[PDB]
TrEMBL record:
Single annotated GO MF: lipid binding
Domain of life: Bacteria
Organism of derivation: Lachnospira eligens
Coiled coil ranges: none
Pfam families, A to Z: DegV
Identification of the protein by name: DegV family protein
InterPro entries assigned: DegV, DegV_C, DegV_domain_contain
SUPFAM superfamilies: DAK1/DegV-like (SSF82549)
Keywords per UniProt: Lipid-binding
Length: 276
């Protein structure tokens, strides 16, 4: 019966076997609005932004888009990108407020993922698994936050220009990636912000740094989700490394959506995993 809702930073549009709706964020220039929905041509957006010399912006969904996504269901879990970097969580809480004044039996839990992308996806899949196990809303609502403590996110970005111009990473940290061939490796912090771990020259050195970070994080071969921004080659190499080193069988590599493509930028990869 239950409904799962997430903002479009989760990169997915369906959850097979589940009732699920994604709620689009938007990316804008002074000339065009790109809505992160089924219609978006991300390759074309990235082409436009690469040669666009002006400022570009993102926006969280409107209260009305959330209400449309809630539909009329009486048990809803909403997963949002980190409240530490975005007004999305607050917009969902505002829409929940209106919804509960319109649906007297409704229960709505808004989950600040404290992260983005594949970590939102791992949360959504765990909600789906508990729902399929027949857990009740109250059991799931309590248990998901404990489950989240055993998940981590790491990223490797070739450019941090869009993060930096929107005030979401420091200039010193972004400047590293200005050098051709240098990526910045990050993790989601305990405050739901982007914590830079170090720089890295080339794919093979990334793989070795990621293996050390996963070891230290307590990774033991559990669920692993990797999204990429026009870098399937690198995501596949990471997935191969992890399967070899940890025995992982539950891996998915997939494309980033519009919002993550904008902030991770061409070449970027983001990964999330369950830890012990
Ligand atoms: C805490 C997560 C760290 C991982 C960062 C990897 C880059 C992806 C996208 C992050 C998006 C952060 C800002 C989103 C702003 C949306 C808005 O306009 O409110
Ligand atoms: Na770079």
């Amino acid at each position: 019966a239950m409904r799962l809702v997430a903002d479009s930073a989760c990169d997915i549009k369906e959850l097979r076997g589940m009732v699920f709706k994604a709620v689009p964020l938007t990316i804008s220039t002074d000339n065009e609005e790109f809505c992160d929905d089924g219609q978006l041509d991300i390759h074309r957006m990235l082409d436009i932004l690469e040669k666009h010399k002006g400022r570009s912006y993102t926006a969280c969904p409107g209260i009305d888009a959330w209400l449309e996504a809630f539909g009329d269901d009486d048990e809803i879990f909403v997963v949002t990108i980190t409240a530490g970097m975005s007004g999305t969580y607050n917009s969902a809480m505002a829409a929940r407020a209106v919804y509960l004044e319109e649906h007297p039996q409704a229960k709505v839990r808004v989950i600040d993922s404290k992260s983005t992308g594949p970590q939102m996806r791992i949360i959504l899949e765990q909600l789906q698994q508990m729902i399929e196990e027949g857990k009740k809303f109250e059991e799931i609502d309590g248990a998901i936050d404990a489950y989240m403590q055993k998940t981590r996110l790491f990223c490797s970005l070739k450019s941090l220009h869009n993060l930096a111009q929107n005030g979401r990473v420091s200039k010193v940290v972004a400047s590293a990636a200005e050098v051709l061939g240098i990526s910045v490796i990050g993790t989601a912090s305990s405050h739901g912000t982007l914590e830079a771990i170090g720089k890295c020259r080339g794919d093979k050195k990334l793989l070795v740094k990621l293996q050390a970070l996963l070891d230290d994080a307590g990774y033991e071969g559990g669920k692993l989700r990797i999204c990429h921004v026009e870098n399937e080659a690198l995501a596949d190499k990471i997935a191969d490394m992890i399967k070899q080193a940890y025995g992982t069988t539950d891996v998915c590599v997939y494309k980033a959506g519009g919002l993550c493509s904008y902030y991770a930028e061409r070449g970027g990869i983001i990964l999330s995993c369950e830890t012990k």
